[PDB]
Amino acid sequence: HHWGYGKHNGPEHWHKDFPIAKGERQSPVDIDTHTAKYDPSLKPLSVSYDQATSLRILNNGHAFNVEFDDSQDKAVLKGGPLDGTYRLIQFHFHWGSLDGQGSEHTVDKKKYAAELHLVHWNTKYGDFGKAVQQPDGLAVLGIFLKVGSAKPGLQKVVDVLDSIKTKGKSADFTNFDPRGLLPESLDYWTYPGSLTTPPLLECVTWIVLKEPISVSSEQVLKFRKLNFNGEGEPEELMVDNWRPAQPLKNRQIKASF
Numbered sequence: 001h002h003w004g005y006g007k008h009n010g011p012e013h014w015h016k017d018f019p020i021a022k023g024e025r026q027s028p029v030d031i032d033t034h035t036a037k038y039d040p041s042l043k044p045l046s047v048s049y050d051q052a053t054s055l056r057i058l059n060n061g062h063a064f065n066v067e068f069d070d071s072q073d074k075a076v077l078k079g080g081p082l083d084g085t086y087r088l089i090q091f092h093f094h095w096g097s098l099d100g101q102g103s104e105h106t107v108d109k110k111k112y113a114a115e116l117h118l119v120h121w122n123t124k125y126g127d128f129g130k131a132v133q134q135p136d137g138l139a140v141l142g143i144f145l146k147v148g149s150a151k152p153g154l155q156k157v158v159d160v161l162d163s164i165k166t167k168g169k170s171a172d173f174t175n176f177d178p179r180g181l182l183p184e185s186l187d188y189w190t191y192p193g194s195l196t197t198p199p200l201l202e203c204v205t206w207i208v209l210k211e212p213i214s215v216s217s218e219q220v221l222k223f224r225k226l227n228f229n230g231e232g233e234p235e236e237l238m239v240d241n242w243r244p245a246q247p248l249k250n251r252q253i254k255a256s257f
Ligand SMILES: Cc1onc(-c2ccccc2)c1-c1ccc(S(N)(=O)=O)cc1
Pocket: 089, 117, 119, 120, 121, 128, 132, 138, 140, 194, 195, 196, 197, 198, 199
């Protein structure tokens, strides 16, 4: 009986195996834009993905991860609320069964069709394993997806999904440039949070971009063709793999603009 997004193993059940699920800095959260405050102490955000080198794409039974070689300081996130350098290790998405839901973070309670998470670990800790034992070990850049015009930079990802339909399947995925998934503006909201899936570790500095990227209905429809199940098992479409907004508790969301 492993965790998932169903009625008997979904978000409302996670706290039993992962008590931190009811912690003091859980993610995602609703971003109340009127309550968020501009923070002048924030330095310019730096997203340097020019030397990013992807290696593989994997269906882990919850979502699919595009993995990067993080053995060297190449694709890095710096500036903004961050102290030091954070290295990109992988990115994935959360999406819904319908266009009106799918994102984890919400803006004034509005849910987007999906949400992209670019995961980075603080290099001062040597490896991501050690990083997830630190309150500032991770930085996740979140980007909302709305349905409209297609995102050319996303097509390569969409076209390989047929090769990793079921849980456990992986496929070579080299030379993918994540720069093609970034909106024009880097305006963002930031707050201290957690991983949004078990283990739900509270080691993440969240940086959520205000400007969503547009993807086509056809592109997201292909996301919805993936399976939560492994090969040879009854088909359970990989949809609504998002955790709902959690209590803000003693936290303040800061705006870069
Ligand atoms: C599950 C899991 O197992 N390991 C990780 C992980 C991997 C690399 C760095 C940090 C966490 C994760 C993981 C869990 C949640 C997220 S999220 N949705 O970006 O908060 C991202 C990664």
